[PDB]
Scaffold this motif. Structure first.
Motif, PDB file in Angstrom:
ATOM      1  N   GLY B  38       0.797  -1.205   0.000  1.00  0.00           N
ATOM      2  CA  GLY B  38       0.000   0.000   0.000  1.00  0.00           C
ATOM      3  C   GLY B  38       0.829   1.253   0.000  1.00  0.00           C
ATOM      4  O   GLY B  38       2.058   1.211  -0.128  1.00  0.00           O
ATOM      5  N   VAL B  39       0.140   2.378   0.133  1.00  0.00           N
ATOM      6  CA  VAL B  39       0.784   3.669   0.172  1.00  0.00           C
ATOM      7  C   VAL B  39       0.265   4.428   1.385  1.00  0.00           C
ATOM      8  O   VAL B  39      -0.726   4.024   2.001  1.00  0.00           O
ATOM      9  CB  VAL B  39       0.501   4.475  -1.111  1.00  0.00           C
ATOM     10  CG1 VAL B  39       0.847   3.644  -2.326  1.00  0.00           C
ATOM     11  CG2 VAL B  39      -0.958   4.899  -1.163  1.00  0.00           C
ATOM     12  N   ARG B  42      -1.620   2.964   4.813  1.00  0.00           N
ATOM     13  CA  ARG B  42      -1.465   1.514   4.718  1.00  0.00           C
ATOM     14  C   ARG B  42       0.022   1.098   4.702  1.00  0.00           C
ATOM     15  O   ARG B  42       0.400   0.096   5.309  1.00  0.00           O
ATOM     16  CB  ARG B  42      -2.233   0.935   3.523  1.00  0.00           C
ATOM     17  CG  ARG B  42      -2.109  -0.589   3.395  1.00  0.00           C
ATOM     18  CD  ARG B  42      -3.088  -1.167   2.371  1.00  0.00           C
ATOM     19  NE  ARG B  42      -2.820  -2.580   2.099  1.00  0.00           N
ATOM     20  CZ  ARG B  42      -3.333  -3.581   2.810  1.00  0.00           C
ATOM     21  NH1 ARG B  42      -4.135  -3.321   3.833  1.00  0.00           N
ATOM     22  NH2 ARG B  42      -3.047  -4.837   2.502  1.00  0.00           N
TER      23      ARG B  42
HETATM   24 CL   LIG Z   1      -3.237   1.626  -0.005  1.00  0.00          CL
END
Ligand SMILES: [Cl-]
Ligand SMILES: [Cl-]
Ligand SMILES: [Cl-]
Ligand code: NA
Ligand code: NA
Ligand code: NA
Lengths: 94, 94
Positions: B38-39, B42
């Motif tokens: 994720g980014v 997350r």
């Molecule tokens: Cl994400």
């Protein structure tokens, strides 16, 4: 200093504040040492050098702060960091 | 997903935007896969999980973007990432 970075075995980093390049020459010396270390600007330079030369960069915030607070360039690593650095060196060096 | 992170072999990270946890089970499957990725928030979660469980976190910006752009969770890694991930796995797994 940062000319030696290409010969680093690993860099310990805290994004994006701290980088510590580690030297290790088990053929000659029993302990790893700090090749170069810094924060901010200088950290960015060390990181950029490592990336260019394919030196592994490990994220470890506590270890990076610890190396920075207790170690010195061209000095074998602090006792308090010895086991954590060794873990990194154990696999990196296999 | 992020429950599986403790079993990750490595996490590929781009500070502090991207994290990709890699699974590898050479006893059973020929290829590594993406456990979770994720980014932003997350990514931070994945990083925090990895730190807690002693999973190595490698800082590799191009690889992290690449895994993020082309891979999927619970899918063997993209061909374009295979060799770079293998380099990480080669030492980590020794
Ligand atoms: Cl994400
Ligand atoms: Cl500095
Ligand atoms: Cl110093
Ligand atoms: Na960390
Ligand atoms: Na197994
Ligand atoms: Na990088």
């Amino acid at each position: 200093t940062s000319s030696q970075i290409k010969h680093a075995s690993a860099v310990v980093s805290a994004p994006k504040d701290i980088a510590v390049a580690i030297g290790y020459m088990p053929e000659k010396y029993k302990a790893p040492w700090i090749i170069a270390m810094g924060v901010n600007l200088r950290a960015k330079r060390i990181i950029a050098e490592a990336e260019k030369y394919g030196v592994p960069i490990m994220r470890n915030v506590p270890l990076a702060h610890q190396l920075l607070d207790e170690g010195k360039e061209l000095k074998f690593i602090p006792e308090t960091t010895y086991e954590a650095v060794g873990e990194i060196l154990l696999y990196i060096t296999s």
